[PDB]
């Protein structure tokens, strides 16, 4: 990913352009996401293929359950910028509903329908390119493992619709964090699954949170152009 | 009264009489004669003019027609530099002095007549509420290589970003946000009232005035209803 970004940034520069991996540079058009396809393996066999839903193993489902359980904390690493949340907004294709499906592209977790069981895997859609590769991937794993170790069942797949109509039962099903602060706070509280195996230390986590809170503050404290449009004549 | 007119000529030291009428499209038209051309004849036989000049009227052979002053409509023009009296006219067929088939005022009068004739009622009441826009700049064109239209007004929301000589004072009605913010957001109070005062000096009765919904100067002056033909005159 690091090399990828490096190549993109530099080839662009050499061509007289400038590239950005910001998640939402423009209001009104697509943001940039970084979907993450994942699967586990042992001695060459795909631990995610099985007889359960869409060709999945029950291990895959526990993994999904883990990701869903710790989504808000993962957000702090997979969507580490205030800008990230301008992409994750109640929109139609917004990968914000904490659920899985092989079709419903409202679900932040898609299940690719593929023939070869060797290629069975899950696609977590909410990450964006601003995410630290390392920390984002790691947090995704640890959440998955904790989903397994604790056999966290996913529940049933959402094949209905996204955030708008639905709007039936006010459609308050699982959702990803709605702001960076919220995500940072989740990471704060829900840190155990990351400390497992001594992978993440409290100090590391607290330091990361502090770095991002400083960023969150700049945006929270600086008047926004739109605020003038909305309130100058108040 | 043709006598009331002759006294208004002396009372206001009128130098000209502006004869007005409307074409098929609805546009008021006019021609002017010195006050000294107003005599007894004028009222009984009107003045002659070329029909073929107005769109959709007489063709190649029957050009000439009659302008019949309606003495009830006499009112002073509040804008012209030299004292002038406006007198609305009907368009009559020469000799027969009937009322041109294509004269919109004659048509409206005929309709008021037919109302009384059927005996269904003796008068029709119309209370129209015309709305309008006030701009600073309007540009447009169309030729073989293209076409365009550009609108501009100090109230236009788009000018929130415009650089102005003495600074942008920026209190503007947003899109669909013109319904009643007090000045300075509403920049047309003084003008709406002048329109009211002048309208009344011309015989209309004003009920209210206010900014309308649209940004960029939509406004409205509400006037009291009147009998159909007199209202169209209004
Ligand atoms: N027969 C009638 N009796 C009373 N008022 C009438 C009659 N016929 C028409 N009107 C007209 O109703 C109009 C005025 O009010 P307005 O505040 O502009 O209403 P709206 O909120 O529908 O725009 C005037 O044109 C008024 O004179
Ligand atoms: Mn994808
Ligand atoms: Mn109105």
């Amino acid at each position: 990913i690091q090399i990828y970004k490096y190549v993109v940034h530099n080839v662009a520069h050499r061509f007289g352009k400038t590239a950005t991996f910001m998640p939402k540079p423009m209001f009104g058009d697509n943001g940039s996401g970084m979907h993450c396809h994942m699967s586990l393996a042992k001695n060459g066999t795909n631990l995610f293929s099985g007889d359960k839903y869409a060709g999945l193993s029950e291990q895959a489902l526990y993994y999904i359950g883990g990701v869903i359980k710790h989504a808000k904390a993962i957000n702090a690493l997979a969507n580490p910028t205030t800008n990230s949340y301008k992409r994750l907004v109640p929109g139609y294709e917004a990968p914000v509903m904490l659920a899985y499906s092989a079709r419903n592209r409202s679900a932040s977790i898609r299940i690719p329908v593929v023939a070869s069981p060797k290629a069975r895997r899950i696609e977590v859609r909410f990450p964006d390119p601003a995410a630290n590769p390392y920390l984002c991937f790691a947090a995704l794993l640890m959440a998955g493992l904790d989903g397994i170790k604790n056999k966290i069942h996913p529940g049933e797949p959402m094949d209905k619709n996204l955030y708008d109509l639905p709007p039936e039962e006010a459609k308050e099903i699982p959702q990803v964090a709605g702001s960076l602060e919220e995500a940072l706070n989740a990471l704060d509280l829900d840190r155990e699954f990351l400390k497992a195996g001594g992978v993440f230390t409290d100090e590391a986590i607290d330091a990361y949170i502090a770095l991002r809170r400083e960023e969150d503050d700049r945006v929270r404290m600086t008047p926004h152009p739109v605020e003038f449009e909305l309130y100058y004549s108040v | 009264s043709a006598e009331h007119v002759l006294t208004m000529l002396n009372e206001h030291e009128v130098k000209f009489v502006d004869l007005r009428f409307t074409d098929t499209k609805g546009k008021e038209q006019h021609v002017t004669i010195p006050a000294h051309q107003v005599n007894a004849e004028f009222f009984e036989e009107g003045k002659m003019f070329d029909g073929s000049s107005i769109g959709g009227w007489k063709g190649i052979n029957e050009s000439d027609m009659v302008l019949m002053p309606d003495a009830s409509t006499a009112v002073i023009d509040p804008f012209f530099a030299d004292s002038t009296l406006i007198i609305r006219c009907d368009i009559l067929e020469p000799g027969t002095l009937q009322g041109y088939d294509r004269d919109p005022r004659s048509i409206a009068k005929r309709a008021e007549d037919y109302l009384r004739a059927t005996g269904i009622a003796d008068t029709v009441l119309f209370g129209p509420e015309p709305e309008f826009f006030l701009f600073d700049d309007i540009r447009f064109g169309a030729s073989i290589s293209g076409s365009h239209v550009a609108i501009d007004d100090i109230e236009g929301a788009w000018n929130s970003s415009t650089k102005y000589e003495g600074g942008n004072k920026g209190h503007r009605p947003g899109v669909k946000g013109g319904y009643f913010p007090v000045p300075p957001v509403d920049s047309a109070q003084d003008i709406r009232s002048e329109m009211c005062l002048v309208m009344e000096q011309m015989g209309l009765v004003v009920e209210a005035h206010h900014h309308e919904v649209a940004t960029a100067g939509q406004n409205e002056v509400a006037t009291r209803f009147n009998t159909m033909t007199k209202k169209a005159d209004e």
Side-chain angles (χ1 to χ4, degrees):
Chain A
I1 277 311
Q2 293 305 65
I3 289 171
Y4 178 105
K5 292 187 172 196
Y6 181 70
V7 172
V8 167
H9 278 139
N10 292 86
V11 170
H13 179 80
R14 288 199 154 18
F15 273 60
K17 308 220 104 190
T18 165
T20 185
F21 288 90
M22 284 181 87
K24 192 75 165 191
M26 300 176 280
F27 169 80
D29 210 334
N30 238 231
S32 290
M34 184 188 237
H35 297 170
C36 293
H37 290 229
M38 293 167 295
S39 72
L40 293 172
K42 190 145 72 178
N43 319 295
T45 64
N46 191 340
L47 279 51
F48 274 34
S49 74
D51 55 57
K52 306 286 190 300
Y53 182 91
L56 292 174
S57 76
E58 70 162 33
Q59 190 169 94
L61 300 166
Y62 288 150
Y63 195 97
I64 297 190
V67 172
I68 296 188
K69 185 178 183 171
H70 311 294
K72 297 189 194 291
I74 299 170
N75 282 151
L77 302 132
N79 304 285
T81 74
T82 62
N83 190 243
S84 284
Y85 300 87
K86 258 142 249 199
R87 166 173 169 265
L88 298 179
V89 279
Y92 242 62
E93 306 150 324
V96 304
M97 306 278 126
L98 258 22
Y100 63 108
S101 168
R103 48 228 320 253
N104 192 36
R105 279 192 191 221
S106 315
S108 38
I109 311 206
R110 191 166 53 74
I111 310 295
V113 174
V114 58
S116 178
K118 296 183 178 176
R120 214 83 75 200
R121 63 206 187 243
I122 65 174
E123 184 192 46
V124 183
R125 328 260 294 186
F126 61 78
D128 66 53
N132 185 326
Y134 305 104
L135 310 187
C136 175
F137 295 176
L140 245 7
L141 220 206
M142 304 298 283
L145 298 190
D146 187 78
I148 289 170
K149 286 177 82 80
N150 302 200
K151 300 171 168 302
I152 308 197
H153 204 262
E156 299 299 310
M158 251 46 93
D159 287 69
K160 258 283 278 66
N161 221 26
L162 27 117
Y163 109 88
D164 213 283
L165 52 132
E168 304 145 1
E169 43 171 58
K171 204 52 56 160
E172 54 184 285
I173 70 162
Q175 262 177 252
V176 302
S179 71
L180 176 60
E181 188 188 322
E182 174 177 351
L184 290 177
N185 179 251
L187 169 67
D188 183 10
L189 306 183
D190 189 33
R191 61 175 81 198
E192 284 321 304
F193 82 99
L194 262 3
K195 294 161 71 179
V199 165
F200 281 84
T201 79
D202 289 298
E203 295 217 331
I205 294 179
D206 295 316
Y208 178 88
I209 292 179
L211 277 186
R212 303 305 200 174
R213 293 207 122 127
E214 182 180 61
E215 295 184 328
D216 188 51
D217 282 349
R218 294 284 317 278
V219 185
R220 285 192 316 99
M221 295 165 80
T222 308
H224 187 128
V226 175
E227 288 177 336
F228 291 82
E229 181 191 322
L230 259 17
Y231 319 117
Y232 182 81
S233 296
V234 115
Chain B
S1 184
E3 308 96 69
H4 165 241
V5 167
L6 279 133
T7 75
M8 262 189 116
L9 289 185
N10 287 82
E11 196 178 288
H12 296 280
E13 298 171 286
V14 180
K15 304 297 174 227
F16 302 90
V17 168
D18 195 51
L19 271 15
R20 294 187 192 174
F21 66 99
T22 292
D23 69 2
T24 299
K25 292 181 181 179
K27 188 77 200 180
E28 206 178 355
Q29 318 281 316
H30 81 308
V31 54
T32 306
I33 67 193
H36 66 62
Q37 286 302 107
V38 171
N39 48 35
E41 303 223 343
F42 181 59
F43 288 101
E44 294 137 15
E45 52 191 19
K47 280 290 196 287
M48 290 291 265
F49 85 118
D50 177 42
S52 74
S53 42
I54 306 298
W57 277 12
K58 289 281 187 89
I60 43 291
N61 266 68
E62 349 89 73
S63 5
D64 276 67
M65 221 107 82
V66 190
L67 265 173
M68 185 54 58
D70 176 333
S72 71
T73 69
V75 62
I76 290 293
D77 186 292
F79 311 116
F80 298 167
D82 302 291
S83 203
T84 128
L85 187 72
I86 305 169
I87 294 174
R88 195 137 247 128
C89 300
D90 298 302
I91 309 305
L92 311 177
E93 203 67 69
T96 140
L97 263 59
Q98 213 22 67
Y100 188 34
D101 281 343
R102 280 121 109 143
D103 168 11
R105 201 178 183 240
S106 286
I107 297 188
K109 276 172 154 184
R110 289 180 186 178
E112 278 207 272
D113 285 342
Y114 174 94
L115 200 238
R116 279 181 294 261
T118 63
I120 303 203
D122 53 37
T123 54
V124 218
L125 266 25
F126 271 81
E129 310 173 310
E131 284 164 345
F132 58 90
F133 277 95
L134 292 184
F135 300 142
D136 283 330
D137 181 53
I138 175 65
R139 279 177 286 123
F140 59 77
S143 68
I144 185 170
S145 66
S147 60
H148 72 282
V149 53
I151 290 152
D152 206 9
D153 188 67
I154 197 167
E155 287 191 1
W158 55 87
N159 282 320
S160 61
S161 57
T162 300
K163 295 210 213 193
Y164 284 87
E165 240 290 276
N168 188 316
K169 310 311 184 177
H171 282 300
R172 302 179 166 78
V175 176
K176 289 176 212 292
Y179 240 66
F180 303 158
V182 295
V185 178
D186 169 15
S187 75
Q189 178 72 194
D190 291 337
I191 195 181
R192 279 194 311 274
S193 294
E194 248 292 286
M195 293 180 174
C196 290
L197 300 181
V198 181
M199 272 178 198
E200 290 191 343
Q201 286 165 30
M202 293 186 82
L204 277 65
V205 194
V206 176
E207 298 188 321
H209 86 52
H210 56 93
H211 193 110
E212 256 287 346
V213 176
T215 178
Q218 193 175 224
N219 293 92
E220 181 176 356
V221 175
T223 57
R224 190 202 58 163
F225 66 90
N226 204 335
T227 55
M228 180 163 111
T229 300
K230 205 169 293 130
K231 194 54 194 183
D233 286 349
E234 294 189 1

